[PDB]
């Protein structure tokens with residue numbers, strides 16, 4: 001949330017990179033670094049805080065009632081066939097893949113019916129994704 | 136949340152990288168580093184905090200009632216066949232894969248019906264993902 | 271949450287890397303490092319804190335009632351066949367795999383019906399994932 005990077009290959013503060021087939025002959029490198037860093041993140045100052053929830057019921061009739069959670073899956077159908085016939089023939093199935101429901105990165109976080117939240121929360125993702133490398 | 140990186144190959148503060156087929160002849164490297172780092176993360180100051188929940192019921196009729204959790208799976212069908220016939224033929228199935236429901240990284244975190252939360256919580260993911268490398 | 275890295279190959283503070291087929295002849299490396307690090311993470315200051323939950327019932331009728339947990343699996347069907355016939359033929363199944371429901375990394379954390387939470391909690395994942403390397 002402050003100093004988040006995505007760095008492909010090389011990361012450095014001071015880099016004297018030298019690579020194939022070079023001459024580094026009579027150099028006189030000199031450095032003088034002062035890199036102070038003061039972090040005061042998420043410092044808080046609270047005198048009072050109240051999280052109050054009340055429920056009063058009385059002399060009431062509560063008939064057929066449903067409270068359903070956030071995500072519901074019902075009557076979901078995946079009906080993928082694969083019929084292959086061959087009579088005096090040549091078939092060369094190379095790098096053939098059939099992909100059905102699939103995830104890689106799944107993060108859920110208090111997806112509820114009732115929630116009273118105070119504070120800090122976050123979700124950070126960094127990857128190098130690559131599905132198929134079919135050479 | 137502060138200093139999160141994704142670094143591909145090389146990470147350094149001061150790097151004098153030298154690589155194939157080079158001459159590093161008469162150099163006079165010199166360094167002088169002051170790298171102070173002060174972290175005061177998540178320091179808090181609370182005098183009072185109350186998490187209050189009450190429930191009062193009375194002289195009430197509560198008939199057929201359902202409270203369902205966040206995620207419900209019902210009547211879910213995966214019906215993938217694979218019929219392969221061959222009569223005097225050649226078939227060369229190379230690198231063939233059939234993928235049905237599958238996860239890699241799954242993190243859940245207090246996905247509830249009722250939640251009273253105070254404080255800090257987060258979810259961080261860093262990977263190098265690669266599904267198929269079919270050379 | 272502070273200094274989390276994902277570093278591919280090399281990690282260093284001061285690195286004088288030298289690699290194949292090089293001459294490191296008359297160098298005069300010199301260092302002077304002061305790398306103070308002060309961490310005061312998660313220091314707290316509380317005078318009072320109350321987690322209060324009460325439930326009062328009285329002279330009420332509670333008929334057919336269900337409270338269901340967060341995740342419910344019902345009537346889930348996986349019906350994948352694999353019929354292979356062959357009459358005077360050649361079949362070369364190489365690197366063939368059938369994948370049904372499967373996980374690698376699964377972390378759950380107090381996904382409940384009722385929860386009163388105070389403090390800190392998090393979930394961190396770092397990997398090098400690779401499903402199939404079929405050379």
Ligand SMILES: *[C@@H]1O[C@H](CO)[C@@H](O)[C@H](O)[C@H]1NC(C)=O
Pocket residue numbers: 025026161
């Ligand atoms: C630097 O090095 C080269 C070597 O080829 C030399 O000829 C030259 O006199 C040097 N200079 C100093 C200032 O040392």
Ligand SMILES: *[C@@H]1O[C@H](CO)[C@@H](O)[C@H](O)[C@H]1NC(C)=O
Pocket residue numbers: 032033034
């Ligand atoms: C290097 O940095 C320090 C930091 O104050 C300074 O006092 C000094 O003059 C600088 N130069 C040299 C040659 O040390």
Ligand SMILES: *[C@@H]1O[C@H](CO)[C@@H](O)[C@H](O)[C@H]1NC(C)=O
Pocket residue numbers: 045047180
């Ligand atoms: C708020 O400021 C500082 C904390 O950073 C502290 O000196 C002061 O007393 C705090 N206020 C109260 C009411 O505690």
Ligand SMILES: *[C@@H]1O[C@H](CO)[C@@H](O)[C@H](O)[C@H]1NC(C)=O
Pocket residue numbers: 063064
């Ligand atoms: C509502 O009540 C009737 C009978 O009073 C019942 O048949 C029906 O199933 C109830 N509603 C639901 C959604 O179940």
Ligand SMILES: *[C@@H]1O[C@H](CO)[C@@H](O)[C@H](O)[C@H]1NC(C)=O
Pocket residue numbers: 026160161296
């Ligand atoms: C640096 O090294 C080279 C070696 O080829 C030499 O000729 C040169 O005189 C040197 N210079 C100093 C200042 O040492």
Ligand SMILES: *[C@@H]1O[C@H](CO)[C@@H](O)[C@H](O)[C@H]1NC(C)=O
Pocket residue numbers: 167168169302
């Ligand atoms: C190096 O850094 C220190 C830090 O204060 C400084 O006193 C000094 O002058 C710098 N230079 C040398 C050559 O030490």
Ligand SMILES: *[C@@H]1O[C@H](CO)[C@@H](O)[C@H](O)[C@H]1NC(C)=O
Pocket residue numbers: 045180182315
């Ligand atoms: C808030 O500020 C500092 C803690 O960082 C402390 O000196 C002060 O007493 C705190 N306030 C109370 C009411 O404790």
Ligand SMILES: *[C@@H]1O[C@H](CO)[C@@H](O)[C@H](O)[C@H]1NC(C)=O
Pocket residue numbers: 064198199
């Ligand atoms: C509601 O009540 C009736 C009878 O009073 C019952 O048949 C029905 O199943 C109830 N509702 C549900 C959703 O079960």
Ligand SMILES: *[C@@H]1O[C@H](CO)[C@@H](O)[C@H](O)[C@H]1NC(C)=O
Pocket residue numbers: 161295296
């Ligand atoms: C550095 O080493 C080389 C060896 O080839 C030499 O010729 C040169 O005089 C040296 N320089 C110093 C300053 O030692």
Ligand SMILES: *[C@@H]1O[C@H](CO)[C@@H](O)[C@H](O)[C@H]1NC(C)=O
Pocket residue numbers: 302303304
């Ligand atoms: C190295 O660092 C120290 C730290 O204060 C400093 O006193 C000194 O002058 C620096 N240089 C040398 C050559 O020691």
Ligand SMILES: *[C@@H]1O[C@H](CO)[C@@H](O)[C@H](O)[C@H]1NC(C)=O
Pocket residue numbers: 315317
């Ligand atoms: C809050 O600040 C510091 C702790 O960091 C301490 O001196 C002070 O007494 C704390 N407050 C109370 C009420 O204890």
Ligand SMILES: *[C@@H]1O[C@H](CO)[C@@H](O)[C@H](O)[C@H]1NC(C)=O
Pocket residue numbers: 199333334
């Ligand atoms: C509700 O009550 C009736 C009889 O009073 C019963 O048949 C029914 O099964 C109840 N509801 C549920 C969901 O079981």
